[PDB]
Design an enzyme around this catalytic site. Structure first.
Site, PDB file in Angstrom:
ATOM      1  N   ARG A   1      -1.282-107.244   8.538  1.00  0.00           N
ATOM      2  CA  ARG A   1      -2.067-106.051   8.254  1.00  0.00           C
ATOM      3  C   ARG A   1      -2.829-106.180   6.933  1.00  0.00           C
ATOM      4  O   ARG A   1      -3.991-105.764   6.833  1.00  0.00           O
ATOM      5  CB  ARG A   1      -1.160-104.838   8.218  1.00  0.00           C
ATOM      6  N   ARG A   2      -2.181-106.723   5.896  1.00  0.00           N
ATOM      7  CA  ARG A   2      -2.838-106.852   4.599  1.00  0.00           C
ATOM      8  C   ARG A   2      -3.921-107.926   4.642  1.00  0.00           C
ATOM      9  O   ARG A   2      -5.066-107.681   4.252  1.00  0.00           O
ATOM     10  CB  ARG A   2      -1.807-107.168   3.515  1.00  0.00           C
TER      11      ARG A   2
ATOM     12  N   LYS B   1       9.238 -98.370   7.338  1.00  0.00           N
ATOM     13  CA  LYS B   1       8.394 -99.309   8.067  1.00  0.00           C
ATOM     14  C   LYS B   1       9.186-100.478   8.621  1.00  0.00           C
ATOM     15  O   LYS B   1       8.688-101.198   9.490  1.00  0.00           O
ATOM     16  CB  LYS B   1       7.271 -99.833   7.172  1.00  0.00           C
ATOM     17  N   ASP B   2      10.395-100.696   8.134  1.00  0.00           N
ATOM     18  CA  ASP B   2      11.223-101.740   8.713  1.00  0.00           C
ATOM     19  C   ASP B   2      11.926-101.269   9.972  1.00  0.00           C
ATOM     20  O   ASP B   2      12.507-102.095  10.686  1.00  0.00           O
ATOM     21  CB  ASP B   2      12.245-102.229   7.679  1.00  0.00           C
TER      22      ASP B   2
ATOM     23  N   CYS C   1       6.741-103.734  13.168  1.00  0.00           N
ATOM     24  CA  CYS C   1       6.526-104.043  11.761  1.00  0.00           C
ATOM     25  C   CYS C   1       5.362-105.015  11.547  1.00  0.00           C
ATOM     26  O   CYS C   1       4.494-104.781  10.695  1.00  0.00           O
ATOM     27  CB  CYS C   1       7.817-104.604  11.170  1.00  0.00           C
TER      28      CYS C   1
ATOM     29  N   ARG D   1       6.366-116.526   0.712  1.00  0.00           N
ATOM     30  CA  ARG D   1       7.660-116.090   1.214  1.00  0.00           C
ATOM     31  C   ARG D   1       8.588-115.727   0.067  1.00  0.00           C
ATOM     32  O   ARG D   1       8.377-116.129  -1.080  1.00  0.00           O
ATOM     33  CB  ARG D   1       8.335-117.187   2.045  1.00  0.00           C
TER      34      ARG D   1
ATOM     35  N   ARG E   1       8.591-114.013  -5.151  1.00  0.00           N
ATOM     36  CA  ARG E   1       7.144-114.120  -5.123  1.00  0.00           C
ATOM     37  C   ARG E   1       6.566-114.012  -6.526  1.00  0.00           C
ATOM     38  O   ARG E   1       5.589-114.696  -6.853  1.00  0.00           O
ATOM     39  CB  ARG E   1       6.573-113.068  -4.193  1.00  0.00           C
TER      40      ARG E   1
HETATM   41  C1  LIG Z   1       6.930-104.206   8.294  1.00  0.00           C
HETATM   42  C2  LIG Z   1       6.983-104.940   6.953  1.00  0.00           C
HETATM   43  N1  LIG Z   1       8.062-105.036   6.146  1.00  0.00           N
HETATM   44  C3  LIG Z   1       7.742-105.749   5.052  1.00  0.00           C
HETATM   45  C4  LIG Z   1       8.717-106.064   3.907  1.00  0.00           C
HETATM   46  C5  LIG Z   1       9.048-104.747   3.216  1.00  0.00           C
HETATM   47  N2  LIG Z   1       9.703-103.683   3.756  1.00  0.00           N
HETATM   48  C6  LIG Z   1       9.788-102.711   2.812  1.00  0.00           C
HETATM   49  C7  LIG Z   1       9.187-103.184   1.671  1.00  0.00           C
HETATM   50  C8  LIG Z   1       9.038-102.401   0.376  1.00  0.00           C
HETATM   51  C9  LIG Z   1       8.017-101.296   0.689  1.00  0.00           C
HETATM   52  C10 LIG Z   1       8.577-100.105   1.490  1.00  0.00           C
HETATM   53  O1  LIG Z   1       9.804 -99.796   1.403  1.00  0.00           O
HETATM   54  O2  LIG Z   1       7.797 -99.409   2.218  1.00  0.00           O
HETATM   55  C11 LIG Z   1       8.735-104.428   1.912  1.00  0.00           C
HETATM   56  C12 LIG Z   1       8.001-105.339   0.944  1.00  0.00           C
HETATM   57  C13 LIG Z   1       6.575-104.866   0.685  1.00  0.00           C
HETATM   58  O3  LIG Z   1       5.832-104.475   1.631  1.00  0.00           O
HETATM   59  O4  LIG Z   1       6.126-104.923  -0.493  1.00  0.00           O
HETATM   60  C14 LIG Z   1       6.406-106.113   5.176  1.00  0.00           C
HETATM   61  C15 LIG Z   1       5.593-106.895   4.134  1.00  0.00           C
HETATM   62  C16 LIG Z   1       5.727-108.404   4.311  1.00  0.00           C
HETATM   63  C17 LIG Z   1       4.973-109.092   3.168  1.00  0.00           C
HETATM   64  O5  LIG Z   1       4.893-110.351   3.117  1.00  0.00           O
HETATM   65  O6  LIG Z   1       4.474-108.391   2.240  1.00  0.00           O
HETATM   66  C18 LIG Z   1       5.932-105.574   6.330  1.00  0.00           C
HETATM   67  C19 LIG Z   1       4.529-105.724   6.942  1.00  0.00           C
HETATM   68  C20 LIG Z   1       3.512-104.810   6.280  1.00  0.00           C
HETATM   69  O7  LIG Z   1       3.854-104.083   5.313  1.00  0.00           O
HETATM   70  O8  LIG Z   1       2.336-104.761   6.710  1.00  0.00           O
END
Ligand SMILES: *Cc1[nH]c(Cc2[nH]cc(CCC(=O)O)c2CC(=O)O)c(CCC(=O)O)c1CC(=O)O
Length: 319
Positions: free
Chosen positions: A114-115, A63-64, A226, A132, A138
């Site tokens: 999204r959340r 997702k990144d 993202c 953050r 966190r």
């Molecule tokens: C697009 C997006 N990235 C993140 C930060 C992120 N990226 C990967 C992870 C671990 C989960 C995975 O590998 O799929 C994470 C951290 C997480 O989601 O727990 C986010 C989240 C930002 C936040 O503040 O939680 C996002 C946006 C999204 O997921 O909607």
């Protein structure tokens, strides 16, 4: 000779990299694997080492990764999906509770639009606020201060840390559909390095690959990335690929959620596919049959158009 694996110096990134290297070492016990951690500051940076042949592959959370990688780079492996769902970690004073049972105006910490949008819709008695930091930060903010009653985190991340036990609630899709590609790791490599593409191809999990093609084609056709209030749910059963997708206003009041399906059988066998084939939503999988890949991409485009037909763009442009 020696496979060099580049990695961010952060902890979830290193854990993710190590599990991939370990799977590669299972398939290739006769091959040398080396991890190179790189400062992203000085005390894209990874892509720069790839094109400069300083490392050969890099592991990412799918997702990144944007829906189109810069040419010269490709996602050469979509690993078997881990748990895709969002989870809730509660304040020590509130263990054993749920989001329904938190006191009204309890503050829930998340920086994901999204959340926040989905959960405001479903629990109006709660407040959602930006928080953050990485996961350890966190969790320290949740534990040591009284600002937050709970935080939202990806399950898969807490499981890579071995912090399963801090999960109080796992969100079902009717409460919070996950992000495109959540829970799946993606291996980025040079688009033209055929030796490394063939090498990491062993990691493609066909089912995860296809549902992540459907999710990423859906995301791309909404021109998203993202950080947008788009969410998806995929599943393959009975020869059918089910893609559910949704968009939300930041507050969550305007929403569109729809589902479509297509007949797409999970490929059993590997194949020597053509090397001239173009990548799909940034993914290269010559060893998996191309047909289901293209059908899955078509499922993502179709649903996106149906959402667009119902006004999804005016919601997204405002976000
Ligand atoms: C697009 C997006 N990235 C993140 C930060 C992120 N990226 C990967 C992870 C671990 C989960 C995975 O590998 O799929 C994470 C951290 C997480 O989601 O727990 C986010 C989240 C930002 C936040 O503040 O939680 C996002 C946006 C999204 O997921 O909607």
């Amino acid at each position: 000779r020696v496979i060099r694996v580049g990695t961010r110096k952060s902890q979830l990134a290193r854990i993710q990299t190590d599990s991939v290297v370990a799977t590669l070492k299972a398939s290739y016990p006769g091959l040398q694997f080396e991890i190179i951690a790189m400062s992203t500051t000085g005390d894209k940076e990874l892509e720069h080492a790839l094109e400069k042949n300083e490392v050969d592959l890099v592991v990412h959370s799918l997702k990144d990764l944007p829906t189109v990688l810069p040419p010269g780079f490709t996602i050469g492996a979509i690993c078997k999906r881990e748990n895709p769902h969002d989870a809730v970690v509660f304040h020590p004073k509130f263990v054993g509770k749920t989001l329904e049972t938190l006191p009204e105006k309890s503050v829930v910490g998340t920086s994901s639009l999204r959340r926040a949008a989905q959960l405001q819709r479903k629990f109006p008695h709660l407040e959602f606020r930006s928080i953050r930091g990485n996961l350890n930060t966190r969790l320290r903010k949740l534990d040591e201060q009284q600002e937050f009653s709970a935080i939202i985190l990806a399950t898969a991340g807490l499981q890579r840390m071995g912090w399963h036990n801090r999960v109080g609630q796992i969100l079902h899709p009717e409460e919070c559909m996950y992000a495109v590609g959540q829970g799946a790791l993606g291996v980025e490599v040079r688009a033209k390095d055929q030796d490394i593409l063939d090498l990491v191809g062993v990691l493609h999990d066909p089912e995860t690959l296809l549902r992540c093609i459907a999710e990423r084609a859906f995301l791309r056709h909404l021109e998203g990335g993202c950080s947008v209030p788009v969410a998806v749910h995929t599943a393959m059963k009975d020869g059918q690929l089910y893609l559910t997708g949704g968009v939300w206003s930041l507050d969550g009041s305007d929403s569109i959620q729809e589902t479509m399906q297509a007949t797409i059988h999970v490929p059993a066998q590997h194949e020597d596919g053509p090397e001239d084939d173009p990548q799909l939503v940034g993914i290269t999988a010559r060893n998996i049959p191309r047909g289901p890949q293209l059908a899955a991409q078509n499922l993502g485009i179709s649903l996106a158009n149906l959402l667009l037909s119902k006004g999804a763009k005016n919601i997204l442009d405002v976000a």
